[PDB]
Design a protein around this ligand. Structure first.
Ligand SMILES: CC(=O)N[C@H]1[C@H](O[C@H]2[C@@H](O)[C@H](O)[C@@H](CO)O[C@@H]2O)O[C@H](CO)[C@@H](O[C@@H]2O[C@H](CO)[C@H](O)[C@H](O)[C@H]2O)[C@@H]1O
Ligand SMILES: CC(=O)N[C@H]1[C@H](O[C@H]2[C@@H](O)[C@H](O)[C@@H](CO)O[C@@H]2O)O[C@H](CO)[C@@H](O[C@@H]2O[C@H](CO)[C@H](O)[C@H](O)[C@H]2O)[C@@H]1O
Ligand SMILES: CC(=O)N[C@H]1[C@H](O[C@H]2[C@@H](O)[C@H](O)[C@@H](CO)O[C@@H]2O)O[C@H](CO)[C@@H](O)[C@@H]1O
Ligand SMILES: CC(=O)N[C@H]1[C@H](O[C@H]2[C@@H](O)[C@H](O)[C@@H](CO)O[C@@H]2O)O[C@H](CO)[C@@H](O)[C@@H]1O
Ligand code: NAG
Ligand code: NAG
Ligand code: NAG
Ligand code: NAG
Ligand code: CA
Ligand code: CA
Ligand code: CA
Ligand code: CA
Ligand code: MN
Ligand code: MN
Ligand code: MN
Ligand code: MN
Lengths: 238, 238, 240, 240
């Protein structure tokens, strides 16, 4: 009924909303967090990037809820003698949303409690164990209004290898499914849970990414998006 | 390579940029020009509406030019004892473009001379003969940087009948083709000419509509867009 | 409940049903009529190998569809063109009928309510007994006498790009042709009731013929073809 | 240079090649194995009627493709499941091989470099001589002994949604299954060199079998199916 789709193999700032440290490089890579002139990622970085047009997720007249899917390739790399931190996430957020706290909160939250007014749904690729809320192994998590994921799966993170993600949402079943594959390693990971978008999100949202680097020396990473495809469909009744 | 598409059967202001008199009605119709509380169109109206995300039309590094296509249904209706004026157009314009002069200039031009800095490509559905530049019969016209169309075809306009338009641009041949059908009348019209987008338009544009009503009593119309689908593709080299 | 699409920039025999003189060249072109220079009295048809459901008697639903194709009709010097080519919807298993001006679709020029034929013709030869005098695009329903035509300013050897669309909500069949090198364009539209003409399942494809009389001959080459159908279209998406 | 896609929410025989016990029910379901309650020693296969080009020897190009489908495997009380179902790519004209645990695709459990078979199996029965002990999703290349498996927590009568993707630029075949009612998900991935296994043109579809021994039986119903391939994919577009 209403349908939107886009697909980019290279990025440009013109059709993106970039926040904080997010940049588009001369190679057309979406570099969510800061990288210095030496090619090295820096500490206490936070950036977010969204598609410039809002996307309708649900309709309060008809009660319809969109189905959507997104795919993207990302590269998280780590300097020798550091470990990675903190990760990146694909997000659906209110129009006008501004960055929240950095580090392990991923620019999405101000603390680690549930916040029913966060209006945040995200799929996180978390590279740093945060003792107060995370499982110990690195993980893909489904986040609904909290940094404490409603569901996670173990992610065997490998630095500098391109990761291909597919996230799908089927509004008939309310199932959100996230998967990651490393084509060069032939490894694959998947997590799934139900999410009630209509109870969490505004009718219109912005879609895109958030990422942070570690705040403590020895915990840092690049957070580069290399390609992105999104599609959504919302029924109108004809 | 870069791809964008969207399709709406009903409209909402959230993902549109609306200028001047353009509104979205409670029925989700995009009403480009003013209609009063009696359902009657008013004189000296001008409105424009665009998709909120800019669209890349060409790339100055690779030299690639997008191919695109758009379809839409419109309804132009006229009160008894008036004739129609002035028409509507599908447009590609610079990001940030503001309305120009009203009436026969369609909110796109300031006079009827060629302006090499207008950066305007439009397909017009012109319901009012303007003696200084138009063919006498109502017409579909291809407009490049001037209200004086580079090419026109006769359009047998009928008030209040839904018109379905398809406009296509093939960057390999540079051919722009515009067609209109009235499904209820079984009539159809087509016009085609080449346009060099790279020489006329900026690399990024906004896509959408402009419309005006007559400035003189007895020349007035509604200019309602009822549905709109757009798709573009720009090669990146992989 | 049902969607089908395909698009070919180069052809191969494996997924086509080829009839009579229709060949796939080694350069990937679908040459519907014979080339030894084209020859006389040729008939060729070509279809996609999977049947397409266009309507359903249990639900009443009728498909919307669209097809685009590029064709090249060329003519030898000291000859004129004949007879033309058509895009067709036919019953599963259909066999070629009569040659020449009947385009391989009919036995005679009278209406036949058992032909189960819907076609869009690109007619290069004036047949005194049924055609308009100028060369034409026509919508054919169970007869070689088109229900609707438009004038087509045929030019030999120029690539022609066709778009045909059918909207089941309005019953409107629209056919357009452009010559991108010449910047010329043509369009014809009329309603067709598919429910009452075609069987529930059809084969989609092409038919073409050359003239049976010396001096009236042409090539009938299809260079690319896309098709899409939906049964319970986005024309901006399809056209691209 | 070549694209093909279809999507069915309801099935019909007209555009399918059905083999052995495979039927289309009157409610539009593709029941791959026999239901009198499912019965023993059943084998059924079903294919799309048009051949799909997966690679080309003149250009070297290999297709990328994706397929999604919903299936329901159900089991009678006082019975366990067997033997499973698979999505397959096979040579044009392929005929059913042996029943039971060989899923209608092989004669024995040894590697056969002439089977020209690429399959994704949903294996419901532990075959002592080649399978892992838990029920599994497997990638089969010219053998019933999967090159790669993942554990599948099979649950009877629950709709399962499958996505299979092949990326010709990485050679990676990925297969995932979700049970939306249970919120469970499974994934397996491995590289497959299609060029060296399959002929240039293939038929795509399904195979399924029931157990040959009392107490090991199941239905193998496909409820919907979408396929897309491209030969010179957008997974966000396809999945939707
Ligand atoms: C309490 C905690 O999680 N501490 C980790 C620290 O978190 C930051 C901040 O990112 C987080 O949002 C906030 C929540 O209140 O707490 C702190 O301010 O981040 C550092 C890395 O920058 C972690 O330290 C590293 O942890 C690794 C865990 O595997 C490993 O032990 C490293 O050696 C260590 O430096 C804090 O654990
Ligand atoms: C000169 C001219 O075109 N005049 C028509 C007038 O145009 C406006 C304005 O819209 C236009 O952009 C500008 C260009 O310099 O000129 C004028 O300011 O618009 C009116 C209608 O509002 C036309 O009058 C109507 O024309 C009809 C032509 O078929 C018909 O004659 C009507 O009876 C008449 O009122 C001016 O012709
Ligand atoms: C009567 C007529 O149409 N003559 C033209 C001729 O047509 C052929 C054939 O193509 C037609 O299908 C049948 C229908 O009766 O008639 C003739 O046999 O084709 C010639 C070129 O091949 C034209 O010059 C004739 O005018
Ligand atoms: C040896 C074995 O696998 N036994 C199981 C049996 O398998 C069948 C058949 O399905 C296999 O394809 C062939 C391969 O040699 O062996 C047997 O004939 O299936 C039973 C259920 O039908 C299992 O209980 C046996 O364990
Ligand atoms: C994006 O495109 C614009 C052209 O409008 C150009 O000015 C800008 O430098 C581009 N950015 C990058 C990172 O290439
Ligand atoms: C469009 O949607 C928004 C919901 O954010 C609503 O406030 C607004 O009234 C809608 N406009 C129309 C014309 O329906
Ligand atoms: C069609 O495909 C087969 C390979 O399967 C091959 O023999 C033939 O050359 C192909 N035809 C063309 C025109 O490429
Ligand atoms: C398949 O189509 C034919 C009509 O062409 C019909 O006889 C049959 O009922 C259809 N099958 C189903 C399951 O609808
Ligand atoms: Ca963390
Ligand atoms: Ca005018
Ligand atoms: Ca004729
Ligand atoms: Ca087994
Ligand atoms: Mn986490
Ligand atoms: Mn004009
Ligand atoms: Mn004719
Ligand atoms: Mn197995």
């Amino acid at each position: 009924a209403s349908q939107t789709s886009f697909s980019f193999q290279r990025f440009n700032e013109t059709n993106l909303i970039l926040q904080r440290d997010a940049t588009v490089s001369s190679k057309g890579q979406l570099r969510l967090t800061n990288v210095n002139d030496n090619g090295e990622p820096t500490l206490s970085s936070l950036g977010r990037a969204f598609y410039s047009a809002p996307i309708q997720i649900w309709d309060n007249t008809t009660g319809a809820v969109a189905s959507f899917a997104t795919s993207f390739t990302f590269n998280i790399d780590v300097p020798n003698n550091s470990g990675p931190a903190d990760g990146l996430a694909f997000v659906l957020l209110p129009v006008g949303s501004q960055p929240k706290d950095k580090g392990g909160l991923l620019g999405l939250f101000n603390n680690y409690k549930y916040d029913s007014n966060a209006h945040t749904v995200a799929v996180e690729f978390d590279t740093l164990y945060n003792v107060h809320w995370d499982p110990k192994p690195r993980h893909i998590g489904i986040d609904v209004n909290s940094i404490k994921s409603i569901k996670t799966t173990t992610w065997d993170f490998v630095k500098g290898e391109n990761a291909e993600v597919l996230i799908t949402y089927d509004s008939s079943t309310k199932l959100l499914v996230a998967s990651l594959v490393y084509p060069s390693l032939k490894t694959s990971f998947i997590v799934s849970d139900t999410v009630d978008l209509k109870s969490v999100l505004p009718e219109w949202v912005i879609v895109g990414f958030t990422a942070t680097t570690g705040i403590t020396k020895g915990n840092v990473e690049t957070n580069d998006i290399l390609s992105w495809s999104f599609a959504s469909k919302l029924s109108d009744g004809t």
